[PDB]
């Protein structure tokens, strides 16, 4: 199997779109114009009416682009997601993720972000959206919340790998980062 580093078991919607490689937009570019092309090619293979080639109505060329647009996005969305899960090459992405997470910890801010959801709803929104891309063909669902069930150990962002000592980051211990499980239950164990 061609495993790699597990960046984020439940990548956020805004981060998946951000990490689109230039090839990924090209895929989206093809799918958005491939759908009008496939309708044209179908008329080439066999015309809808008569025995001669007739370009489909301009109205159909508009809806087909919409189908291709929302169709070609998911091929880009799925391609980017496999880099987070570890199913696809993610050397480029690991460098980007570690820099941002280290920047978040260095500024005493959570890697995941502030949330409008109470601790239960964060847990609930993890289970609904995690691995939803495996059904993204059938129907869409995205991880749009700033929850914390990303299936990682944050201490893997503490040790310095090769080519990272130049960033000159200082990282406080985890018990002092805003919006984390370990640094939230300081007064009542029932409430954040």
């Amino acid at each position: 199997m061609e495993t790699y580093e597990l960046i984020d078991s439940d990548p956020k919607f805004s981060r998946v779109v951000r990490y689109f490689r230039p090839s990924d937009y090209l895929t989206w570019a093809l799918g958005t114009i491939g759908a009008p092309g496939l309708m044209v090619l179908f008329e080439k293979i066999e015309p809808a009416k008569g025995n001669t080639f007739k370009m489909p109505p301009p109205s159909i060329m508009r809806i087909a682009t919409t189908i291709g647009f929302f169709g070609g996005f998911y091929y880009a969305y799925t391609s980017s997601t496999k880099r987070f899960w570890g199913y696809s090459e993610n050397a480029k992405e690991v460098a980007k993720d570690r820099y941002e997470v280290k920047k978040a910890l260095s500024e005493k801010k959570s890697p995941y972000g502030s949330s409008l959801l109470n601790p239960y709803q964060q847990d609930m929104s993890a289970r609904n959206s995690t691995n939803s891309q495996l059904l993204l063909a059938i129907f869409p669902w995205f991880n749009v919340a700033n929850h914390q069930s990303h299936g990682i150990d944050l201490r893997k962002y503490y040790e310095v790998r090769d080519g990272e000592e130049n960033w000159n980051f200082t990282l406080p211990p985890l018990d002092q980062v805003k919006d984390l499980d370990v640094a939230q239950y300081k007064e009542y164990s029932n409430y954040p």
Partner: protein, 78 residues
């Protein structure tokens, strides 16, 4: 263009006016429903310029102090 049906990708403003004069029940229904999401997305403007959110309600049982039991506790004995 005396009374022509406006084209939606050519005259967006005039296309709205056609459905505001001839189909009032459709145009103004959506507009009222449009304010729903519009005001919902305007909340981050309120969180910084009008007032900040309330604290969450204590709906999780008796708040248990995040500590250990106190051995020295005495009084009100038998």
């Amino acid at each position: 263009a005396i009374g022509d049906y406006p084209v939606y990708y050519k005259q967006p403003i005039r296309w709205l006016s056609y459905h505001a004069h001839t189909r009032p029940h459709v145009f103004y229904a959506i507009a009222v429903a449009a304010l729903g999401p519009v005001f919902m997305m305007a909340t981050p403007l309120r969180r910084k310029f009008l007032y900040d959110d309330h604290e969450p309600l204590p709906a999780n049982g008796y708040p248990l102090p995040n500590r250990s039991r106190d051995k020295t506790l005495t009084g009100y004995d038998d």
